[PDB]
Amino acid sequence: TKCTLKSFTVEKGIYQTSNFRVQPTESIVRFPNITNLCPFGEVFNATRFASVYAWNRKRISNCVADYSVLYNSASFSTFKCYGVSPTKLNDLCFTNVYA
Amino acid sequence: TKCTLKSFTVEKGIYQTSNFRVQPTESIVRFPNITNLCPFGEVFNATRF
Amino acid sequence: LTGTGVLTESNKKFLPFQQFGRDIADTTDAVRDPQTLEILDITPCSFGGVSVITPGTNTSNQVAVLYQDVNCTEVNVFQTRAGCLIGAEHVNNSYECDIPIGAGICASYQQSIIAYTMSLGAENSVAYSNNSIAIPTNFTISVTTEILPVSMTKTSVDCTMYICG
Amino acid sequence: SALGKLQDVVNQNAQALNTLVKQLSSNFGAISSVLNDILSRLDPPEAEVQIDRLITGRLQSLQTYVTQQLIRAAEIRASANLAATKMSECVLGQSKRVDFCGKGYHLMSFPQSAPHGVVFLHVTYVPAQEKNFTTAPAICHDGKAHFPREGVFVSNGTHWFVTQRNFYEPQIITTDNTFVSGNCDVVIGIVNNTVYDPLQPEL
Amino acid sequence: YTMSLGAENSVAYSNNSIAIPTNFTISVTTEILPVSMTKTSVDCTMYICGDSTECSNLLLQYGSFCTQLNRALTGIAVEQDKNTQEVFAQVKQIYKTPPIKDFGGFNFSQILPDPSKPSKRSFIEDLLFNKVTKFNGLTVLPPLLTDEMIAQYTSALLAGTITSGWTFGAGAALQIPFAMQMAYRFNGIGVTQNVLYENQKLIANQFNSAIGKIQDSLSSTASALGKLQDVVNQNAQALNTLVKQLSSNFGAISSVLNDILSRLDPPEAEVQIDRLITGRLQSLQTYVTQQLIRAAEIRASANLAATKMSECVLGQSKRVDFCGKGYHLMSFPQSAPHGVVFLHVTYVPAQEKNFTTAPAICHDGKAHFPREGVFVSNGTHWFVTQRNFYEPQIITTDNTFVSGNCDVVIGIVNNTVYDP
Amino acid sequence: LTGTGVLTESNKKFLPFQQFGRDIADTTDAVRDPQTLEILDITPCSFGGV
Numbered sequence: 001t002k003c004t005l006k007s008f009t010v011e012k013g014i015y016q017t018s019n020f021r022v023q024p025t026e027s028i029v030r031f032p033n034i035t036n037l038c039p040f041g042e043v044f045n046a047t048r049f050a051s052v053y054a055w056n057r058k059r060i061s062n063c064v065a066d067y068s069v070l071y072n073s074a075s076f077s078t079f080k081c082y083g084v085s086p087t088k089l090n091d092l093c094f095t096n097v098y099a
Numbered sequence: 100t101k102c103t104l105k106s107f108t109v110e111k112g113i114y115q116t117s118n119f120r121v122q123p124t125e126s127i128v129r130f131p132n133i134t135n136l137c138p139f140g141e142v143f144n145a146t147r148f
Numbered sequence: 149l150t151g152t153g154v155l156t157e158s159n160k161k162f163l164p165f166q167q168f169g170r171d172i173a174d175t176t177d178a179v180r181d182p183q184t185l186e187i188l189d190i191t192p193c194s195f196g197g198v199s200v201i202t203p204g205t206n207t208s209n210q211v212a213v214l215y216q217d218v219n220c221t222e223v224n225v226f227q228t229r230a231g232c233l234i235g236a237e238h239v240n241n242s243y244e245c246d247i248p249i250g251a252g253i254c255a256s257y258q259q260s261i262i263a264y265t266m267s268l269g270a271e272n273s274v275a276y277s278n279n280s281i282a283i284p285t286n287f288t289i290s291v292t293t294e295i296l297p298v299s300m301t302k303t304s305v306d307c308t309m310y311i312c313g
Numbered sequence: 314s315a316l317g318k319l320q321d322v323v324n325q326n327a328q329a330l331n332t333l334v335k336q337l338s339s340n341f342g343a344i345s346s347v348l349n350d351i352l353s354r355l356d357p358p359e360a361e362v363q364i365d366r367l368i369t370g371r372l373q374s375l376q377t378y379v380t381q382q383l384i385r386a387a388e389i390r391a392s393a394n395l396a397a398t399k400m401s402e403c404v405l406g407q408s409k410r411v412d413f414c415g416k417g418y419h420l421m422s423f424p425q426s427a428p429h430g431v432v433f434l435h436v437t438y439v440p441a442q443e444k445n446f447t448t449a450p451a452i453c454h455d456g457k458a459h460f461p462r463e464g465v466f467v468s469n470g471t472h473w474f475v476t477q478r479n480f481y482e483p484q485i486i487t488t489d490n491t492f493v494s495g496n497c498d499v500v501i502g503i504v505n506n507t508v509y510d511p512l513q514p515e516l
Numbered sequence: 517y518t519m520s521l522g523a524e525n526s527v528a529y530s531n532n533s534i535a536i537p538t539n540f541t542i543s544v545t546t547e548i549l550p551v552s553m554t555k556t557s558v559d560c561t562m563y564i565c566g567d568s569t570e571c572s573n574l575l576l577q578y579g580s581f582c583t584q585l586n587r588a589l590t591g592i593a594v595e596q597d598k599n600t601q602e603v604f605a606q607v608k609q610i611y612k613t614p615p616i617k618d619f620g621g622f623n624f625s626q627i628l629p630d631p632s633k634p635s636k637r638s639f640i641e642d643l644l645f646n647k648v649t650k651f652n653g654l655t656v657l658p659p660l661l662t663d664e665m666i667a668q669y670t671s672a673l674l675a676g677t678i679t680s681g682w683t684f685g686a687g688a689a690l691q692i693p694f695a696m697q698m699a700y701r702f703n704g705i706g707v708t709q710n711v712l713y714e715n716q717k718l719i720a721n722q723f724n725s726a727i728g729k730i731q732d733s734l735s736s737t738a739s740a741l742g743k744l745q746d747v748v749n750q751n752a753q754a755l756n757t758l759v760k761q762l763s764s765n766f767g768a769i770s771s772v773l774n775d776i777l778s779r780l781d782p783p784e785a786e787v788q789i790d791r792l793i794t795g796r797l798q799s800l801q802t803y804v805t806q807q808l809i810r811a812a813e814i815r816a817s818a819n820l821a822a823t824k825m826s827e828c829v830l831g832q833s834k835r836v837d838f839c840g841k842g843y844h845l846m847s848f849p850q851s852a853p854h855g856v857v858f859l860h861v862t863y864v865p866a867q868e869k870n871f872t873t874a875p876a877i878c879h880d881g882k883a884h885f886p887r888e889g890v891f892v893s894n895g896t897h898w899f900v901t902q903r904n905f906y907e908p909q910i911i912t913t914d915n916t917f918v919s920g921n922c923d924v925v926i927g928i929v930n931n932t933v934y935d936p
Numbered sequence: 937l938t939g940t941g942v943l944t945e946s947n948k949k950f951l952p953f954q955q956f957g958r959d960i961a962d963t964t965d966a967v968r969d970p971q972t973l974e975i976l977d978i979t980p981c982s983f984g985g986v
């Protein structure tokens with residue numbers, strides 16, 4: 001009270017404060033378990049690719065894919081990752097992964 | 100009126116739903132009449148050259 | 149000179165020197181025609197908003213629309229100082245204002261929607277004379293109700309949670 | 314709709330609050346309206362710009378909300394001062410202010426509570442059964458002009474009476490309800506009659 | 517120089533001396549009160565964005581700000597109509613004046629409406645209206661009441677107070693001859709009916725001269741109606757500032773969206789676009805906030821005007837300096853473009869003359885007190901005179917009452933009380 | 937959908953395709969646990985003040 005009143009004499013009354021962050025116990029994560037590691041080498045290191053004039057879209061879905069192995073690889077240079085960040089890709093969950 | 104008030108029922112009154120603005124129709128350009136047209140032609144058609 | 153508007157013939161004239169003309173607050177007001185030397189005034193075409201008059205879904209669903217400060221020619225139509233009213237029919241009768249439209253014109257639901265000049269009251273010429281008095285011989289004892297707000301909800305927001313959480 | 318005024322205030326609050334919360338779902342040019350998602354996708358150096366975009370808009374909305382709340386509080390405070398004055402004058406006493414304590418000659422007011430306000434039941438006196446009478450500014454008797462002490466000089470066409478100004482109670486014209494000032498040569502509308510003296514017959 | 521508050525008058529106070537007025541200077545003071553401001557509205561989309569589709573695709577990521585602004589302006593306009601209704605629409609059964617204006621010698625021709633069809637106003641109303649004098653997505657809504665109907669309300673109130681008095685403000689308009697209503701208003705301000713009835717001709721020339729002076733003062737000076745002119749100029753200047761804020765870069769390349777959309781690639785032209793958007797939003801928000809504050813001020817003034825019309829026009833106020841300075845008799849409403857003018861008729865004593873007094877008079881050891889007046893002395897003889905007008909009325913038992921003996925009261929002066 | 941709150945057992949009925957139901961100001965109010973498909977209500981934790 002006396003710190004927010006900027007004084008050492010307070011007198012009668014009521015005086016307020018700031019956020020009441022009731023600290024939540026632990027942390028819960030409820031990601032669905034497909035129990036199927038997503039084979040992601042289907043796209044990057046696989047057979048011969050298509051041409052730019054006829055580019056092809058691949059789909060990976062209903063699987064648990066990890067981008068950390070991709071970023072950690074030093075061969076995979078020239079990253080931009082517009083709209084997101086490579087370090088924060090891991091915790092994100094997606095559905096429409098158009099490759 | 101229902102959509103702007105965002106209520107299915109409305110009550111007696113007057114409500115400014117939207118705005119009306121007249122569309123322009125064709126376009127016009129006006130400049131000083133004729134020209135100060137040069138005696139350029141006498142150069143192209145000169146006799147003593 | 150670039151813009152949009154209605155280019156009407158103007159009675160007021162520039163000097164032979166002056167070619168353009170502005171209005172007060174520095175807005176274009178008239179321009180002399182360069183082809184033939186005469187001065188045409190400018191009045192930008194109507195852009196007044198549109199409003200809807202309704203008696204309420206409880207009574208009916210008929211709609212009357214007011215295009216403010218727009219002639220009915222520039223899209224039963226009734227021309228009013230407030231604007232052009234469509235869907236409401238003018239009537240010579242006078243009634244107490246029900247849905248205020250403006251400039252003395254009010255609308256009401258009477259089947260359809262009728263618009264009129266509000267009646268200020270019943271014209272009552274008091275029987276005044278310099279030797280005539282009116283004394284009451286009775287009374288009423290009237291109980292009326294006067295509602296007055298004295299307080300509102302004591303809301304209180306915290307900026308940190310609202311902005312950051 | 315009788316309590317519409319009170320309802321208005323409530324609405325003017327609730328709507329405002331709703332508007333405020335609806336301002337929490339506005340991008341304000343930012344990538345989203347959720348801080349957690351922005352912090353979970355972008356790096357903090359680049360998430361700072363989006364957080365600034367959200368903060369500027371939210372702070373402007375909050376300041377606008379507080380400003381309109383202050384204006385509403387000013388108007389409600391004016392209304393509360395009016396209500397306190399009406400409780401002090403209409404309720405705790407009898408008010409001679411016209412149309413302050415309802416329409417008509419105010420008699421007394423009864424307060425009643427309402428969720429966010431007060432309702433005054435104004436009991437006022439409205440006289441209505443009119444009768445016209447022929448009227449005199451003054452009465453001439455022995456050249457005295459005999460002005461009325463407390464009432465008006467009405468007449469049934471033929472005879473004259475001194476009634477009170479708000480209820481037809483005729484009473485005869487006597488020296489006890491009538492006082493003398495001057496002679497009958499100055500008053501424009503003087504009317505000649507007889508004022509009765511009680512004392513002489515009382516002998 | 518150092519200002520002087522006025523003349524250092526020193527009243528001739530004494531513990532036995534009074535100053536009883538012997539005349540009066542019936543006067544008509546003037547009061548001007550604003551009751552409404554210009555009903556305006558702004559199309560926030562058209563204002564901020566003009567007609568560009570890109571800006572209209574923005575200003576929605578900013579949320580419901582435009583709805584807030586137009587709702588506030590609509591509320592202000594409805595409040596202006598409510599103010600005009602409260603000040604003027606206070607009388608039922610719009611009244612008319614008799615064809616024969618025999619109001620005890622009084623002359624209300626300048627305030628009464630004239631058939632010569634200036635709208636339907638009166639002479640004073642014509643002078644008042646003579647004295648005080650769209651584009652860019654902002655319009656002015658016409659007032660719900662037109663000046664003719666406001667003048668009709670004014671004429672109805674004037675006819676009710678001229679013929680009926682204060683009765684039309686309670687129930688039905690009980691007609692009562694003029695110069696008899698005014699006698700009762702004197703009764704209300706203390707002086708008896710004798711003053712008016714014996715001074716009836718004088719109290720019509722005083723009032724007519726006051727009305728003529730009001731006419732001359734209103735005609736002469738251009739700053740007479742300064743309050744309404746200030747209101748109009750303030751509204752016009754706020755509108756002009758709002759308009760001129762459009763031609764402001766606000767940190768962008770230009771104040772015209774077309775130029776920015778022309779000379780820049782839209783992805784980075786977005787920065788200039790929303791810089792202009794924020795600037796115009798701030799300007800509009802400031803305009804709305806100041807309009808709301810000024811509307812609160814105008815609402816206070818309109819409530820004051822309604823209270824005055826209820827108490828001054830429709831009654832006789834005992835409140836001091838409320839309906840003009842002096843003992844208020846009755847008031848007259850007149851309409852002005854955005855306000856009301858009250859012609860406060862007041863009574864002012866003037867022409868004083870001092871005598872010597874006594875709290876009570878001792879007769880037969882009984883300490884008579886004055887029933888309704890003051891005890892005064894001509895230096896030789898004592899009289900009971902009313903407190904606002906010199907009228908001797910030699911002391912009798914009818915106008916004095918006995919409260920004991922001549923011991924406790926301090927300023928006892930021995931005398932005789934006549935017995936009828 | 938990160939955030940803190942109390943996850944009470946929900947009583948609202950969901951479309952078998954609807955994943956998470958919001959409310960005014962698009963705050964995540966109800967959510968289906970991806971495993972053991974059921975409905976839960978997210979309610980903000982105690983944020984009163986002192």
Ligand SMILES: *[C@@H]1O[C@H](CO)[C@@H](O[C@@H]2O[C@H](CO)[C@@H](O)[C@H](O)[C@H]2NC(C)=O)[C@H](O)[C@H]1NC(C)=O
Pocket residue numbers: 040041044045069070073075
């Ligand atoms: C490429 O295919 C291999 C499967 O054999 C995986 O990546 C290999 O990882 C090992 C050790 O982690 C390295 O020694 C190899 O050089 C990698 N192979 C490469 C780079 O071609 C993985 O399945 C694929 N890499 C992806 C998907 O990034």
Ligand SMILES: *[C@@H]1O[C@H](CO)[C@@H](O[C@@H]2O[C@H](CO)[C@@H](O)[C@H](O)[C@H]2NC(C)=O)[C@H](O)[C@H]1NC(C)=O
Pocket residue numbers: 131132133182183184185
């Ligand atoms: C533009 O041209 C017209 C005609 O070529 C000029 O106006 C003519 O003026 C004469 C006499 O003043 C009239 O008899 C004609 O009827 C006019 N013509 C028309 C079409 O109205 C005009 O002066 C020219 N503008 C200039 C020179 O600025």
Ligand SMILES: *[C@@H]1O[C@H](CO)[C@@H](O[C@@H]2O[C@H](CO)[C@@H](O)[C@H](O)[C@H]2NC(C)=O)[C@H](O)[C@H]1NC(C)=O
Pocket residue numbers: 140141143144
């Ligand atoms: C003056 O010069 C002009 C410009 O060259 C001539 O205009 C054209 O001239 C050619 C050749 O003389 C003709 O074939 C065209 O028909 C002319 N055009 C027009 C529109 O007439 C013009 O003829 C010359 N004047 C003369 C030669 O008397």
Ligand SMILES: *[C@@H]1O[C@H](CO)[C@@H](O[C@@H]2O[C@H](CO)[C@@H](O)[C@H](O)[C@H]2NC(C)=O)[C@H](O)[C@H]1NC(C)=O
Pocket residue numbers: 285286287
């Ligand atoms: C004043 O008005 C009241 C009614 O407002 C009159 O009382 C009514 O009298 C009639 C017959 O005399 C009865 O049938 C009604 O039932 C009465 N009404 C009430 C409410 O009591 C009263 O008579 C009037 N005053 C005079 C002097 O006639």
Ligand SMILES: *[C@@H]1O[C@H](CO)[C@@H](O[C@@H]2O[C@H](CO)[C@@H](O)[C@H](O)[C@H]2NC(C)=O)[C@H](O)[C@H]1NC(C)=O
Pocket residue numbers: 469470471472
């Ligand atoms: C004038 O008012 C008086 C007051 O009552 C009326 O005089 C009396 O009327 C009654 C009948 O109602 C008679 O019985 C009395 O003899 C009257 N007293 C008199 C004449 O002194 C009288 O009727 C009224 N005059 C009118 C209405 O013209």
Ligand SMILES: *[C@@H]1O[C@H](CO)[C@@H](O[C@@H]2O[C@H](CO)[C@@H](O)[C@H](O)[C@H]2NC(C)=O)[C@H](O)[C@H]1NC(C)=O
Pocket residue numbers: 277278279501502618
């Ligand atoms: C009331 O005023 C009128 C005129 O101002 C007077 O009474 C009328 O006088 C005319 C002629 O002077 C007569 O034709 C009418 O019949 C009269 N009517 C009435 C009702 O008296 C008179 O000066 C005033 N009356 C009083 C009593 O003061």
Ligand SMILES: *[C@@H]1O[C@H](CO)[C@@H](O[C@@H]2O[C@H](CO)[C@@H](O)[C@H](O)[C@H]2NC(C)=O)[C@H](O)[C@H]1NC(C)=O
Pocket residue numbers: 453455456497503504505
């Ligand atoms: C008083 O009544 C009489 C009745 O005519 C009128 O005044 C009288 O006028 C005559 C001369 O015309 C005098 O001789 C009388 O002395 C008067 N009577 C008095 C003074 O009482 C007149 O109608 C009345 N006086 C008024 C109304 O002032």
Ligand SMILES: *[C@@H]1O[C@H](CO)[C@@H](O[C@@H]2O[C@H](CO)[C@@H](O)[C@H](O)[C@H]2NC(C)=O)[C@H](O)[C@H]1NC(C)=O
Pocket residue numbers: 539540541718721722725
């Ligand atoms: C009370 O004051 C008024 C003026 O306010 C006096 O009226 C003036 O009287 C003189 C002489 O009698 C006249 O020449 C003026 O024309 C009067 N003026 C007006 C406007 O009528 C009145 O005389 C004073 N009363 C007394 C008793 O002296």
Ligand SMILES: *[C@@H]1O[C@H](CO)[C@@H](O[C@@H]2O[C@H](CO)[C@@H](O)[C@H](O)[C@H]2NC(C)=O)[C@H](O)[C@H]1NC(C)=O
Pocket residue numbers: 623624625626
């Ligand atoms: C009330 O005052 C007005 C204006 O002061 C008078 O109107 C005048 O009428 C007479 C002839 O009718 C002329 O002097 C003028 O036409 C009007 N104006 C002026 C300035 O005099 C009106 O006559 C007065 N009322 C009465 C009953 O006389």
Ligand SMILES: *[C@@H]1O[C@H](CO)[C@@H](O[C@@H]2O[C@H](CO)[C@@H](O)[C@H](O)[C@H]2NC(C)=O)[C@H](O)[C@H]1NC(C)=O
Pocket residue numbers: 894895896897
């Ligand atoms: C004060 O006024 C009284 C009342 O008029 C005066 O007494 C009267 O004086 C006159 C002449 O001065 C006599 O005719 C009266 O008979 C007196 N009235 C009586 C005796 O009752 C008194 O003189 C005045 N005093 C002054 C002017 O100083």
Ligand SMILES: *[C@@H]1O[C@H](CO)[C@@H](O[C@@H]2O[C@H](CO)[C@@H](O)[C@H](O)[C@H]2NC(C)=O)[C@H](O)[C@H]1NC(C)=O
Pocket residue numbers: 531532926927928
């Ligand atoms: C007003 O004040 C004066 C001044 O004291 C009083 O006059 C005095 O009266 C007493 C006897 O009553 C004398 O002894 C004094 O000499 C007087 N004073 C003067 C200065 O002469 C007077 O009594 C007071 N009157 C009232 C009503 O209070």
Ligand SMILES: *[C@@H]1O[C@H](CO)[C@@H](O[C@@H]2O[C@H](CO)[C@@H](O)[C@H](O)[C@H]2NC(C)=O)[C@H](O)[C@H]1NC(C)=O
Pocket residue numbers: 878880881922928929930
């Ligand atoms: C009243 O007059 C007398 C002087 O004539 C004074 O009062 C008298 O006081 C004596 C005793 O002091 C009593 O015996 C008398 O009866 C009184 N006379 C009365 C009451 O008439 C005194 O000067 C006067 N009273 C005042 C001035 O208040």
Ligand SMILES: *[C@@H]1O[C@H](CO)[C@@H](O)[C@H](O)[C@H]1NC(C)=O
Pocket residue numbers: 033034035971972
């Ligand atoms: C996936 O999670 C569900 C949770 O109900 C569990 O029943 C199932 O066995 C899991 N699949 C595995 C472990 O492969």
Ligand SMILES: *[C@@H]1O[C@H](CO)[C@@H](O)[C@H](O)[C@H]1NC(C)=O
Pocket residue numbers: 206207
């Ligand atoms: C409005 O609706 C109610 C029922 O919702 C009905 O009782 C009432 O009569 C309606 N008012 C009308 C028809 O004017």
Ligand SMILES: *[C@@H]1O[C@H](CO)[C@@H](O)[C@H](O)[C@H]1NC(C)=O
Pocket residue numbers: 218219220221227
């Ligand atoms: C429509 O606008 C006004 C309103 O009636 C009118 O004076 C004007 O002549 C009309 N415009 C036309 C007929 O082009």
Ligand SMILES: *[C@@H]1O[C@H](CO)[C@@H](O)[C@H](O)[C@H]1NC(C)=O
Pocket residue numbers: 238239240
């Ligand atoms: C009455 O209404 C009709 C049709 O609206 C109109 O022609 C007429 O001028 C109005 N007035 C009179 C007095 O008929």
